[model samples]
Target chain A: AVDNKFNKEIQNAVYEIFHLPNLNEEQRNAFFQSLKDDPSQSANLLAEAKKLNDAQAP
Target chain B: AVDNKFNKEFSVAGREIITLPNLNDPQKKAFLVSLWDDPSQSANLLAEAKKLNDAQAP
Candidate 1:
């Protein structure tokens, strides 16, 4: 289904975007799980991620 | 400006969303910096994060 494929793409994007190379498998799993537990928080999470990224720009 | 305020909010949301409590300041800084370096990737990043969150829902 289109929705399923779209969802898969989204999952991949998040993993790539938030990929902390140093984190172990368990830690990464936990992080992803936390995000999924509360969909409503996605907008706020995205906003915060952007802000943090912008603040550190040279 | 409203844009500035909005940006600020977005930043805050990202920080909250991706907050890895165990990570030290240096690691967190690195993560945030990576996000800012590619603004164009945001749409994909958000989609991924949402999917990851959705996948684990009860």
Candidate 2:
């Protein structure tokens, strides 16, 4: 299960934040592993993101 | 200068609260009109939405 599928996919969200255009393989996998099955964590993260968004977005 | 858009067609934001759902034609018109001419109404509605959101959210 230690595949690189996540690295490529997860770069989408990271790129939105850092505008780096690409996430290194490890960064992508870490993010993927972080959310693979933990929807509660995902919800918490999105809530955090919404807070950040509320403060930041137009 | 549009057709019956609020029927989910030409609706180009007629001064309203996006929080409201299942509204009828009159409601849709009121919502659209309220927002179209004055976005301030939409803003107030969103502010008002906080109470409901806070109280009813899970």
Candidate 3:
């Protein structure tokens, strides 16, 4: 019981950490594809990420 | 450059989180098998976990 619960907690942590990486890849791919489909939308997303990162990432 | 840096940081965090869980599974399996092969040591490990958990786990 305790063992299983501990396992579940660790599994949850694993999934949580993966969430950022997974979404990062997804968004990157979508943005790249958007560049091919429409440079306008791709540049828009790029501009958005840049704005957010400029504000957030130091 | 900043995008790559952000990606690397996230990747590093992912790797760090996995370290414990990665070692933990093997530790758990060996402990379980040790329960049958060397009951004393297995019980010792269980007791160790109980002591730690009792002090820690809610």
Candidate 4:
């Protein structure tokens, strides 16, 4: 299992992604949790988030 | 340096891999460095990683 400290760092890395800026605390936590579960999905999730943002953009 | 904090984790993951784990610290360092440069590539990189890992698996 991933440690808390390392997981926090991973969350920060997730936050740094430009595609995921507006996530609230809960959403951010969930996204990072998904990240911890499967590192390979990082790109896919970010891509999904990007699409959501694009859909709502002005 | 991407902070003694982050670069170290990146280096470790690179080393844990069975193949390009052969890359020296500097080469491995590129993974984190590249991530910082282009978050968009995270998916591509992870996909490549899975392929490489799969290739060496059997």
- Which one wins on lDDT? 4
Residue A19 lDDT (model 3): 33
lDDT, candidate 3, B1-58, per-residue tens: 3333333333333333333332354444444333323333443656554454355434
Which segments of candidate 2 are over 4 A away from where they belong?
Answer: A1-58, B1-19, B46-58
Model 3 clashing residue pairs (backbone):
none
* CAPRI level of candidate 2: incorrect
Segments in model 1 whose C-alpha atoms lie over 4 Å from true places: A1-16, A19-33, B1-58
lDDT of 4 by residue, B1-58 (tens): 4433333333233323313533344433455455534545555665566565566554
* lDDT of every predicted structure (CA atoms): 0.44, 0.38, 0.40, 0.48
Candidate DockQ scores, in order: 0.05, 0.01, 0.04, 0.02
**Which predicted model would earn the best TM-score?**
4
TM-score of each candidate's B chain against the true B chain: 0.42, 0.38, 0.34, 0.41
Runs with alpha carbons beyond 4 Å of true place in candidate 3: A1-23, A52-58, B1-58
- Rank order by DockQ, top first? 1, 3, 4, 2
User: Number of clashing pairs, model 2?
Assistant: 8
For residues B1-58, what per-residue lDDT tens digits would candidate 1 score against the true structure? 3333323333433444365444444544444444444434545554554555456445
Show the lowest summed lDDT stretch of 10 residues, model 4 chain A.
A17-26
Question: Which residue pairs collide, candidate 2?
Answer: B5-B10, B5-B11, B14-B32, B14-B35, B15-B32, B15-B34, B15-B35, B15-B36
TM-score of each: 0.27, 0.24, 0.24, 0.32
True contacts kept of 3: 0.06
Q: What is the lDDT of residue B57 in candidate 1?
A: 49
